[PDB]
Structure 1
Amino acid sequence: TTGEAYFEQLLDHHNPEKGTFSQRYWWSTEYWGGPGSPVVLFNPGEVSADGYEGYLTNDTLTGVYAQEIQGAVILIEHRYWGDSSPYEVLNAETLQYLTLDQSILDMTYFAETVKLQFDNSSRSNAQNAPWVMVGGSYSGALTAWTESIAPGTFWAYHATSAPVEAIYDFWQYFYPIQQGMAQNCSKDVSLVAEYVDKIGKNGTAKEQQELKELFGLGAVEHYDDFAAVLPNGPYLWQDNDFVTGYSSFFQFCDAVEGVEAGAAVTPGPEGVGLEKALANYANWFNSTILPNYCASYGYWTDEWSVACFDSYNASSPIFTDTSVGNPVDRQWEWFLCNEPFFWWQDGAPEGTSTIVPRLVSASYWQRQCPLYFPEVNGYTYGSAKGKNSATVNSWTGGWDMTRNTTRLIWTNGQYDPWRDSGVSSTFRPGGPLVSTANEPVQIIPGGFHCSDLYMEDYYANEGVRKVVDNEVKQIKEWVEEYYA
């Protein structure tokens, strides 16, 4: 059966006298073998957890784990998202306790002390039963970082597509997309991105304004805000999985290549060249992306509004909305600016081919932190205080937290936009992590973001099936060691 409950979480694990707030969780005993059986714990991470029921079922990898080991499944909503926020208003003062250490200790404290409605004894808490922590994306890093920082509560860990390395100028976000996309699209998108840079850096004012109008963006006043719309094509790669078919991304590349779906004649790998690619990219954005783009934020209603592209308007509701249920993931922007993780999604450095404009730069994103988070009662965000990526990585270990691990398995995707923040990054010093029996790591061929989490990928792709089968057997083997 299923239910939902609240756990009384510590606001500040370092200072319990500051009190508690109520943290939402959901649970399922569909596969549970009774008190003493395993518990699979999954934190949906950078989002409200309400639309995540499926993780209780074997339609997802967490359910498959549970069925394999006779485990309960618990879905825990992250502090400061949804119904797990201590405050109704999120600003630089109230977000002071939205940190990685608090988020890690939330998980161990919960597993050690929660009173589960389905087992009123202590027999299902983590001191008495094996808890398996599973996470994808940021919650996969939360999972790995918990093994690094606070081992000894959870029994085993699986991290898929985990950004365990903080990186400031994360231009590598786009590198696996460039590698996975078609040759002609990649070439033509790069031509357009670099043309946008040339016109921004060397073109006249009349050239800049005219290029903006091609995209429908003549009213966008800051050139870097125009340049920042070009990644909307590449970003669609993040929505791919092995069952999305002729997806939004592949539609974008066909548009750039100037062909309708199913066309008999298509360009070869050489693409269509700058002039056509520019015209096609401009019209694709103007006609397919721009309409109702700003209206999707709720703050605006006009179909052709460009207000949401103006990142220099300190009064924009994108920056001033402090509500918990905001549509701009303000909570995540806090982690980026404050921890700081950064992961700014940028054009590549000079001398390295790029599929997004180099004018989309780390400084362009960093400039927005004080617009999201103006100083409040003396409180500011961590990167303004001088904290940087190494502050985080030297604590957690970053992608070198792999040194001496126990019962942690990793999965990554060959073409995951988050791969190069993780242990399988091609830019990790000493190369990507080498798999061992003690610490396995698998890369899904052709894989995207968290492709082993969704079982539709398992049935659709034999490469995914091989990876899922291996990690499920590894988790079962490790869990059995608890009872042996």
Structure 2
Amino acid sequence: TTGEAYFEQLLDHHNPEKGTFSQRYWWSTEYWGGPGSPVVLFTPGEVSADGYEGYLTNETLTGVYAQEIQGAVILIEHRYWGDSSPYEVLNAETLQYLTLDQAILDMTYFAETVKLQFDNSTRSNAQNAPWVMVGGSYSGALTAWTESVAPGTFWAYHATSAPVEAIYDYWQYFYPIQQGMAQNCSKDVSLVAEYVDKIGKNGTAKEQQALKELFGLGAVEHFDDFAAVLPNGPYLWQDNDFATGYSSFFQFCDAVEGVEAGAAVTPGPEGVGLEKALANYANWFNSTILPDYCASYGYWTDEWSVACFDSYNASSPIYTDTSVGNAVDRQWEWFLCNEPFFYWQDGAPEGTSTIVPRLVSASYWQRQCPLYFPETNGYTYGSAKGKNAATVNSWTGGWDMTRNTTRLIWTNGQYDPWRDSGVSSTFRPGGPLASTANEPVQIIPGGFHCSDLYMADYYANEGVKKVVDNEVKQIKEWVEEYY
């Protein structure tokens, strides 16, 4: 049996008397064992909960967990998304309560205090029953940070592809993509990305314009903004999966190496060279990607519109649409500018090879925060009041929260673009966290973003199956310890 309910969440957990707001949540007792049985808690994170109904199911890791431990599952919508915002206009004033501190106490308070329709008794709240927090991507960092910051409510935690370390200049976002990408495609995307830099730095107004026209982006005023489209190639890697097959990422690397989908003859490890890779890249963007791009924000109808790419128009609707269901996910942008997480997705520093133009820099992204959030009735975003990535790592422990852990399990993906801000990062001091009995961690060979949350991956790849079986076994053994 299933249901949808509303929980009256505290607006300010340190001031419970500024009042409440309504937060949307769903539950299934499909595998529930009755009072005192476990509860598996999940939030989609930085997104409306519309369409996430599958996480109540054993087609996702969350239900698989519930089936094996005979618990219920509850999907909770994160504050400020979907039907769970305390305000209908999101600016620097109203967004003041969208904070990691508040999100964390949101879950512990919910688990400790919600009056569940399938159990009016207190006997399945977190004080009298084991609650398992599961999350991937930011929700995984939320799971882990709750273990770090408010340890005593949930019984166990599983965090997959969690970016627990806040990083300002996060060029390492593209490092795993470089590694897992084909060699020829890696070298050739490096060539094009470094050419865009040389034209933007040491190049003429005429050279710059010509280059921007190869992509069909001649009307883009700022060269900055043109360089920011090129990761559209590497970005597709995050849409990968062990069941996506011949996916859009691989279609892009074929376009760059000048071949058709099932070609008999292909380039070797060294690729096709700059003059050829430049044209294929440029033609791939103008042909497949650019059409209807801006139109997918709903703010423009023109199929060949080029306005979405203008990050300097302070009046663009990507900045001024303050509605809860805006298109750019400004709520997530607030965490980046205010917490501050940053995670700015940039080209590598000068010593280091890059598949993204170095023009796409931390400053490029930082600049956009006051346009997303102009100063409102005295309030700003935190990185303008002096906060930085150490503001968060000081509090959460970042990478080093692994030092004292209890009943928390990590999964990461070998080629996950969010790997290098998580616990298995190659840049973390000492290298990837070593697995221990007390604190297990495993890396999915060849893995992408949260590639163990969909069961389609379980059947499609024998590596995921090993990882899914071990962690399901660890969550079972740990919950049994509650009795």
Specify the TM-score bucket, using the shorter chain as the normaliser: over 0.9
Structure-1 separation of matches of 2:407 and 2:179: 32
Task: Provide Cα deviations, 1:128-179, integer angstroms capped at 9, x if missing partner.
Answer: 1000000000000000000000011000000000000000000000000000
Structure-1 separation of matches of 2:33 and 2:114: 19
Task: Provide Cα deviations, 1:252-297, integer angstroms capped at 9, x if missing partner.
Answer: 0000000011011111111000000000000000010000000000
- CA shift for structure 1 position 361: 0.1
Structure-2 separation of matches of 1:412 and 1:46: 19
Task: Provide Cα deviations, 1:334-373, integer angstroms capped at 9, x if missing partner.
Answer: 0000000000000000010000000000000000000000
Task: Provide Cα deviations, 1:317-343, integer angstroms capped at 9, x if missing partner.
Answer: 001100000110010000000000000
Structure-1 separation of matches of 2:323 and 2:461: 41
Structure-2 separation of matches of 1:231 and 1:351: 20
Task: Provide Cα deviations, 1:116-136, integer angstroms capped at 9, x if missing partner.
Answer: 000110011000100000000
- CA shift for structure 1 position 379: 0.5
Task: Provide Cα deviations, 1:355-397, integer angstroms capped at 9, x if missing partner.
Answer: 0000000000000000000000000000000100001001000
Task: Provide Cα deviations, 1:201-244, integer angstroms capped at 9, x if missing partner.
Answer: 11111000000000000000000100000000000000000000
Which position in structure 1 is the counterpart of 2:393?
393
Structure-2 separation of matches of 1:327 and 1:218: 25
- CA shift for structure 1 position 51: 1.1
Structure-1 separation of matches of 2:313 and 2:266: 42
2:130 paired with 1:121: no
Which position in structure 1 is the counterpart of 2:87?
87
Task: Provide Cα deviations, 1:11-58, integer angstroms capped at 9, x if missing partner.
Answer: 000001100001000000111111110000001001001110000000
Structure-1 separation of matches of 2:407 and 2:74: 20
Task: Provide Cα deviations, 1:426-448, integer angstroms capped at 9, x if missing partner.
Answer: 00011111110000000000000
Structure-1 separation of matches of 2:474 and 2:426: 25
- CA shift for structure 1 position 314: 0.2
Which position in structure 2 is the counterpart of 1:471?
471
Structure-1 separation of matches of 2:392 and 2:464: 32
Structure-2 separation of matches of 1:384 and 1:320: 19
Structure-2 separation of matches of 1:16 and 1:160: 32
SS, match of residue 481 in structure 2: helix
Which position in structure 2 is the counterpart of 1:332?
332
Structure-1 separation of matches of 2:199 and 2:400: 41
Which position in structure 2 is the counterpart of 1:307?
307
Task: Provide Cα deviations, 1:397-433, integer angstroms capped at 9, x if missing partner.
Answer: 0010001110000000000000000010000011111
SS, match of residue 40 in structure 1: strand
SS, match of residue 311 in structure 2: coil
Structure-1 separation of matches of 2:308 and 2:53: 31
Q: Percent sequence identity over matched residues?
A: 96
SS, match of residue 16 in structure 1: coil
SS, match of residue 124 in structure 2: coil
SS, match of residue 328 in structure 2: coil
Which position in structure 1 is the counterpart of 2:292?
292
Which position in structure 2 is the counterpart of 1:267?
267
SS, match of residue 482 in structure 2: helix
Structure-1 separation of matches of 2:274 and 2:38: 57
SS, match of residue 295 in structure 1: helix
SS, match of residue 82 in structure 1: coil
SS, match of residue 401 in structure 1: helix
Structure-2 separation of matches of 1:3 and 1:202: 61
Task: Provide Cα deviations, 1:454-473, integer angstroms capped at 9, x if missing partner.
Answer: 00000011110000000000
- How big is the alpha-carbon RMSD for the aligned residues of Structure 1 and Structure 2? 0.4
Which position in structure 2 is the counterpart of 1:418?
418
Structure-2 separation of matches of 1:38 and 1:96: 34
Structure-2 separation of matches of 1:88 and 1:105: 22
SS, match of residue 17 in structure 1: coil
Structure-1 separation of matches of 2:35 and 2:274: 64
SS, match of residue 103 in structure 1: helix
Structure-1 separation of matches of 2:399 and 2:45: 19
Structure-2 separation of matches of 1:332 and 1:274: 37
Which position in structure 1 is the counterpart of 2:134?
134
Structure-2 separation of matches of 1:407 and 1:216: 53
Which position in structure 2 is the counterpart of 1:77?
77
Which position in structure 2 is the counterpart of 1:51?
51
Structure-1 separation of matches of 2:367 and 2:337: 10
2:40 paired with 1:22: no
Structure-2 separation of matches of 1:117 and 1:326: 32
Structure-1 separation of matches of 2:64 and 2:185: 37
Structure-2 separation of matches of 1:384 and 1:291: 36
- CA shift for structure 1 position 94: 0.2
TM-score, length-scaled by structure 1:
1.00
Structure-2 separation of matches of 1:17 and 1:40: 29
Structure 1 stretches of 4+ with a deviation exceeding 6 A read: none
SS, match of residue 402 in structure 1: helix
Structure-2 separation of matches of 1:273 and 1:351: 22
Structure-1 separation of matches of 2:143 and 2:101: 12
